[PDB]
Symmetry: D2
Subunit: 254 residues, 4 copies
């Protein structure tokens, strides 16, 4: 559907028919991944807690898009959602650990219950999702995992300690997983966005603030993220593992 | 009788109130002994009661052992409040308690992951949260997060421990910014392969670390403690947000 | 007959003007061939005239070989100006020319150091300086600095080469900021141990890199070229100031 | 002399009588090193192109301070200055590569002659000085090298490409030298300052700008640098090599 963003004009033959799985795929950046992979002719499954948003997107993208309802805090349902994907299409080729929650919170405000919840939606699934797809990949001898990272912890960003600390956690989980699974043919990297404009006056000011702080004087959008994801998924990046790829218009270096 | 760990003397450490988690054994013990030798008032937390009691008794009246399982945040909070009740606001927090037991990626259950994160990461946040208001009232404080080179070197077979350690690398930066306007500096102390209490199997493993290191000698707990004293003292007053790596070059191979 | 290096097709590369130093052989050749396959106009510089001539002849009318010894800044400037005269402003500069010959710390003279810095670092600055005004007039441009993991891994026995490579790591960041307001993005492409044209001695060394890598296969020039195409294309339009490391995990050990 | 800053109250017995060599020692940060080591009772030699500044400082600090005139661009004189130090006191214990020139310069303005000169005063000496002191150290089985680094290249600071690129060069030269010389007992690290107030209206504003950007809301001065240098020199840091130690009040993380 010409209504839905293709995100790039580039064509990656190596993505055709690969099985892709994206968590938090129904909105924002996750939606752009879902769109971009479908446009390259992958078989794309995504998970999201918003069922009516997920259903609309699968309906718009057609039969090579699959929407599986899932709350990533429930590891049981996450492993079930994985098993379903592997049942329908085979072993996953490309896992994108994207689901996350970046609501702001002062350090003094944080209760034990909040911290545990935030760690569960922000960090713990990426581990269990990678744990779930790994053996299928290993059986085949190949696959790719992308962990969505953030420059927020790199820039020491205050006021959201559970989210920045999870993002920092994934930076390290990428390296060690890379080592643990590389012998099996599985490459793992972190895609690290800067300030991506989405849909999640004073808005104009905040937007100009980013442009003033960035090296490249235009705003980043979800397309910039998906363009990096397609490269990281494709055979073009087959020797890259353990690494961060930062798409942030220079905002992390100031 | 006690390991003093350095002949250096830091006048700025005299009388400072120092709180260390997992202080009864290993690295944490070395911190406890080193800061006591500098004249600090040192409170430490540990779930090993017998080890903690013995150590406090051996070090005397400027050591205080509080029993605490760091997974229990309420007890952690209570231990902090009691330190502040006895000696006033903490000057120096060292988030040290950790469990680095090996575990294969394939075998980790939800429950293991939650517990390993709670032992290895969660408490460092809550301990910081507990000491911050007392620090801010006084206008000064230092926090030291014990880090690890293991995640930097992509070390396999202990994903919960390395991921926690990588978590604290980020938590250092962001809390440094969030609290530094209150006068609180926060850094991570990042050791390499520290020797701590098949003879050939041990000897061989120890030789392998020497062979891979740039400096050809084994590191021990004293190396750690000497870095911590500097990171606590007024000599590092302007350092915040940073890692300081004591690893004989093991991380650069 | 030619290595195309990828089956990927980047429409944004069609007709772009690409300048590569040390393009006649090895990695630089792979760049030359890969961008020509995408429909770009590719100019390359090299001191090996016979290799450059043959390559331009083999690739045809959208390849231009300019003889150039990159230590000679005046010639470097002249080659840039001639590219701009034939095809207009450069779209994509790849600072590639380097010499990585081994040399012991103890034995390096002033003259060796100066020459090794001139071959390995200086030209990348001047080449950037030469292409920047033409980029700025058009409002867009990309620069790629070929980096190395060797300094990151503290590799001994070639101090001039590793120090140059570490120099470009910093030069990437600062030129990214200085030129990005003009629309010019700058990144470093950082390969691991790339196979390029005692059999047991070679086989063993190659096996050692496989053993230390995370992915168990040897990297080649094509791996490099496929990253460069992405870093040149509109797919990386928002990436600047950054390293992109293609090393099969060799740098994380 | 009570007139001269001691920089710390800390006492390091392991520094007593060690031989220290500092390039660009007569002014600013280099002067603070010279003062701090003398106060710990080291034998301190420094090099500087400003003879009358160097003479004044050696006169003020007394007989365990030695001032050797030197233009660090002249590698010959630098190796001679080293040989003199080793002749008078033995092998150097602690080398601090501090001399540098941070005049601003637009990228378009830079001529070949400028670039080569700047690289010579900013980078090339640190290599040759480390080359000169190394064999004496190796003979003894011990020593320490500190390379003065800068957060400027880390923060992608524009308008001084020769200086930031040299600083970036030394970041890498620290790692590789660490490996090359570690078997000999020589440890090498980079001391990396933030915005240090020195003596090198609108000044007040610029100063407030740093405080606003820093995490810790006070200015850094030369003492902060020397306090780190003494630790890096002493036996207290005997297991630390190959590393950066950044003293910048959080300015690099923003
Ligand atoms: N916005 C940016 O500038 C930016 C920058 C850096 C990193 N990122 C990262 O990009 C990724 C995508 O972020 P986004 O901005 O599109 O977020 P978003 O919240 O706009 O959309 C993410 C999706 O995740 C879903 N989701 C949230 N909780 C979930 C749960 N428990 N189970 C299942 N689905 C759940 C949301 O409903 C939504 O569908 C995240 O990893 C985030 O950290 C974003
Ligand atoms: N040993 C090394 O090579 C090494 C290397 C890198 C980093 N580190 C870091 O050093 C720090 C100290 O480590 P160590 O090697 O001495 O560890 P250790 O396991 O020997 O000792 C840690 C201490 O914590 C206590 N402890 C553990 N769990 C606890 C809990 N739930 N409640 C209370 N106390 C608890 C233990 O009883 C022990 O006294 C840790 O943060 C570790 O991450 C150690
Ligand atoms: N080979 C690897 O494993 C590897 C690893 C990391 C980084 N790199 C980087 O890859 C880039 C390409 O390297 P390579 O391995 O193909 O090197 P190479 O030495 O095989 O080829 C470099 C090319 O530059 C040309 N050249 C050298 N000096 C020149 C000069 N003064 N004037 C003009 N041309 C000159 C050569 O003639 C050759 O064609 C270099 O920047 C190197 O730093 C290579
Ligand atoms: N100022 C800061 O905020 C800051 C920040 C980061 C790094 N640094 C670094 O700190 C170190 C000291 O800098 P500073 O600010 O005190 O500089 P300064 O210029 O104030 O004093 C440095 C000394 O070096 C001398 N010198 C310069 N050229 C020389 C030459 N060719 N031969 C011999 N001596 C020479 C100067 O005359 C002076 O005596 C340098 O390595 C600099 O990069 C400074």
């Amino acid at each position: 559907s010409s209504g839905m963003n293709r995100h790039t004009d580039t064509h990656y033959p190596s993505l055709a028919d690969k099985v892709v799985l994206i968590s938090g795929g129904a909105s924002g950046i996750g939606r752009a991944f879902v769109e971009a992979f479908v446009a390259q002719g992958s078989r794309v499954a995504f998970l999201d807690l918003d069922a009516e948003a997920g259903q609309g997107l699968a309906h718009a993208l057609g039969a090579n898009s699959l929407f599986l309802p899932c709350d990533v805090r429930d590891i049981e349902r996450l492993k079930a959602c994985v098993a379903e994907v592997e049942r329908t299409w085979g072993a996953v080729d490309v896992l994108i650990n994207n689901a996350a929650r970046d609501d702001r919170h002062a350090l003094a405000d944080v209760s034990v219950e909040y911290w545990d919840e935030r760690m569960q939606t922000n960090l713990r699934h990426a581990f269990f999702a990678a744990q779930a797809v790994a053996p299928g990949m290993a059986r085949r001898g190949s696959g790719a995992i992308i962990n969505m990272g953030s420059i927020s912890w790199m820039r020491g960003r205050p006021g959201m300690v559970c989210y920045t600390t999870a993002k920092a956690a994934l930076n390290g989980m990428t390296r060690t997983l890379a080592r643990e699974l590389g012998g099996q043919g599985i490459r793992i990297n972190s895609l690290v966005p800067g300030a991506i404009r989405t849909e999640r006056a004073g808005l104009e000011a905040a937007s100009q603030a980013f442009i003033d702080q960035q090296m490249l004087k235009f705003r980043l959008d979800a397309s910039d993220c998906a363009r990096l994801a397609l490269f990281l998924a494709s055979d073009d990046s087959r020797g890259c593992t353990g690494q961060n790829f930062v798409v942030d218009a220079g905002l992390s270096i100031q």
